[PDB]
Structures are given as structure tokens and as C-alpha cells.
Amino acid sequence: CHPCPWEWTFFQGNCYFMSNSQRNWHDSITACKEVGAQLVVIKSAEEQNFLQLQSSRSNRFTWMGLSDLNQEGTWQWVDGSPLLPSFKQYWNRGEPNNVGEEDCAEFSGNGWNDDKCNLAKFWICKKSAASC
Ligand SMILES: OC[C@H]1O[C@H](O[C@H]2[C@@H](O)[C@H](O)[C@@H](CO)O[C@@H]2O)[C@@H](O)[C@@H](O)[C@@H]1O
Ligand SMILES: [Ca+2]
Ligand SMILES: [Ca+2]
Ligand SMILES: [Ca+2]
């Protein structure tokens, strides 16, 4: 038994998969479901800080499970949950700007950015860690 699958990362009871290949936003959702997970939905500042740190060091644009596809300007997590006021401090300066229609969120540098959902980027899946 192992709390997390090979190549995954453990943090506060959950396992994260930082992909080494790229996919557009929708295909990233599917990629995570296929491994019993979900395109990362952040539920805490602690989690956000942990993820942001790993992603900035990776120097890779990375998708998260957040979008405003349904209603422009209203960002919602893939778990149907709404983006809380306390998390809006994480957007990069000048973001989200919806330039050229950007409805999917990614980790970019030290914060978040909204980008075109059809662009291929790395992605992070999240699932609960096993105990033993
Ligand atoms: O080129 C830097 C920037 O490019 C992409 O983001 C686009 C857009 O979403 C941004 O708002 C603007 C300004 O930040 O730049 C592009 O037009 C992403 O690859 C992003 O991660 C990157 O920083
Ligand atoms: Ca839109
Ligand atoms: Ca948008
Ligand atoms: Ca943007």
C-alpha cells in the first residue's frame, strides 16, 4: 500500500498528479477522471501556496479546475463550487483579462492567469490519498 500512486505528490491527505504531457482544458478534465481524479479544485490557501510553489518551480503553464465558461466573469470550480473572495487575491497583475476570450484558469509564474481553453498546457489532477 502507498498513500499516493507512483509519480504523484502527497499534500494534506490528497495526491496530486503534475502531468509531463500537455492537453487543452477539457481533455485535462477527462485525463483526471480516467485516473479516478479531478482537475485540481483548490479548497485552501495552504493548498494554493503549495501548488503555486510547485508550479512556479516547474516553469510550466498548468491548468487547474477553474473556468468562467458558463458565465463570463463568474469563475467556478469543476466541482460546481464557486470561487471564493479570499482566493481572488491569487490572480496575476492585470488578470483575469479575458483577452481574445479566455475562460480557463492556469498557474502562471507566481499566480493565476486566464487563458484560451483550447490551448494545450500541463495539468494537475487531485484525489484523496489512501491510508495505511
Ligand atoms: O506571454 C505571457 C503569457 O502568455 C499567455 O497569456 C496570455 C493572456 O492570457 C495574458 O493575459 C497576457 C498578458 O499576461 O499574455 C498572453 O496574451 C500565457 O501563456 C501566460 O501563462 C503567460 O504568462
Ligand atoms: Ca467567455
Ligand atoms: Ca473569461
Ligand atoms: Ca489572461
24: domain CATH number? 3.10.100.10
CA 68–ligand 2 middle distance (angstroms): 6
Q: What are phi and psi of 62, to 5 degrees?
A: -135, 125
Write out the binding residues for Ca(2+). 95, 97, 99, 102, 113-114
Q: Which three cell numbers stand for residue 107?
A: 498557474
Q: Is 30 in the pocket of ligand 1 (CB under 6 A)?
A: no
108 within ligand 1 shell (Cβ under 6 A): yes
Query: C-alpha dihedral over 20, 22, 27, 33, to 10 degrees?
Result: 10
Cis bond upstream, residue 82 (ω within 30): no
- HSE value, Cβ hemisphere, 13 Å, CA-based, for 98: 10
Q: CA 6, CA 24: separation in Å to the nearest integer?
A: 24
DSSP strand pairing (122-128 vs 38-39): antiparallel
Experimental method: X-ray
Q: Which atom of ligand 1 is nearest to the CA of 96?
A: 11
Which value in Å is the resolution of this experimental model?
2.0
From the alpha carbon of 121, which atom of ligand 1 is closest?
19
- Quick check: CB of 53 below 6 Å from ligand 1? no
For 128, the domain range is 1-132
What DSSP string runs through 42-104?
Answer: ---HHHHHHHHHHHHHHT--EEEEEE-SSSTT--EETTSPBPPTTTGGGBPTT----TTS--E
Residue entry with cell 496530486: 16
Total number of domains constituting the chain: 1
